[PDB]
Amino acid sequence: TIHEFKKSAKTTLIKIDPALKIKTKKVNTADQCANRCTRNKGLPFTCKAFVFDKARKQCLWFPFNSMSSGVKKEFGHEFDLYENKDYIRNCIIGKGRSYKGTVSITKSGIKCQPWSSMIPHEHSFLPSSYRGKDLQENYCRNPRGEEGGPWCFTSNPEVRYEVCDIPQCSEVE
Amino acid sequence: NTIHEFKKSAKTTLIKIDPALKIKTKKVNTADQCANRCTRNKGLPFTCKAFVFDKARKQCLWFPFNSMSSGVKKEFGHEFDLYENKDYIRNCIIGKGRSYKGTVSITKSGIKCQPWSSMIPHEHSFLPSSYRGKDLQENYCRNPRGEEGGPWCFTSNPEVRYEVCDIPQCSEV
């Protein structure tokens, strides 16, 4: 069950609007958090994300994610954020600058190269340099809003980079 | 085993109008072997957005399109099951979401939706057959008449006849 979430390591979420519902429980592992979220039982809301507090072994279930108005991502070394993929927009607006989904495959079907790897291709698109852009794992991204939309470096040493095939939100009626 | 992560349409395969589009096929044992390969995208010269398992010919058919892509049509067959990769089924709403085909099946306050084909807990005349094109399948949140509220379902709570589901607008600035 865990993947169906995008994991952000060392991250939690804080609600500003205190009318947004929340539920917590001390649990054993993050997997048990995911299962409760996925099946959505005993939660008076739609579970869109949860955080696992690894220190207190606490599970925090939310009817929002990091793209919801009124919630701040924050660093915290004992937290992992998990976001339900159904609520991360899986289609691109324009050039796809704001694309944060988990597609990690190019249009000709090649598995993307992790941004934190210089094999087979070396590059100056570091996760560190480029904040807010979510150059995490091997996801298709478009950090500079360039023509063909979200892309990646390719695990194939003979294709430096290729765009992925993420649909426009305007593709289907 | 990733098969449970796809949206399943029973008794259905997909046909190419456009002869240009590409397909990969392979003889296998079970439907989850189609799923695993689609999810991993290994050996596919394209992005796998759907697959068909042919239960009579014991074949996977992997596709770089789904039932929504232009130049493709559904075809009936008792032997076929269609599995659509949720990453390529728009998970946000345009307008009132008359066209929404995602798989969210819980209401705003966390109630599991009642199946459209069911009259339990609630009786209604939103029969799938009366509402064609509107994909009133399983217990998914739908807005078959295009009303102000966005997608909704009859609720599995006898106390709550129906409720809106909480599905994000693709774009609202």
Residue numbers in the entry:
A (entry chain A): 38 to 210
B (entry chain B): 37 to 209
What text comes from the article?
The growth/motility factor hepatocyte growth factor/scatter factor (HGF/SF) and its receptor, the tyrosine kinase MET, constitute a signalling system essential for embryogenesis and for tissue/organ regeneration in post-natal life. Two truncated forms of HGF/SF are produced by alternative splicing of the primary transcript: NK1 encodes the N domain and the first K domain (K1),16 while NK2 encodes the N, K1 and K2 domains. NK1 is a monomer in solution, but crystallises as a head-to-tail dimer and all available crystal structures of human and mouse NK1 yielded the same dimer. (c) The lysine-binding pocket of the kringle domain of NK1 is formed by a glycine loop at the top of pocket (E183 and G186), an aromatic “base” (W188) and sides (F162 and Y198), as well as a positively charged anchor at the bottom of the pocket (R197).
In initial experiments HEPES was successfully incorporated into apo NK1 crystals by soaking and bound into the lysine-binding pocket in a mode consistent with previous results. The piperazine moiety of HEPES makes strong carbon and donor π-interactions with W188 and Y198, and weak polar interactions with E183, whereas the hydroxyl group engages the glycine loop in weak polar interactions. A HEPES molecule is bound in the pocket and shown with its carbon atoms in dark gray and its sulphur atom in yellow. Hydrogen bonds between the HEPES molecule and NK1 are represented by dashed lines. All of the compounds discussed here, as confirmed by crystallographic analysis, show the conserved and crucial hydrogen bonds to R197 and the differences in binding affinity reflect additional interactions. This is demonstrated, for example, by HEPES (KD = 2.4 mM) which, compared to (H)EPPS (KD = 7.0 mM) and PIPES (KD = 26.6 mM), forms stronger π-interactions to W188 an Y198, weak polar interactions to E183 and further contacts with the glycine loop. Binding constants obtained from SPR and NMR are comparable and the figures indicate that CAPS and HEPES display the highest binding affinities, whereas PIPES and CHES display the lowest. Inhibition of phosphorylation of Erk 1/2 and Akt (S473) was seen for HEPES, (H)EPPS, MES, MOPS and CAPS at the highest concentration (100 mM, lanes 4).
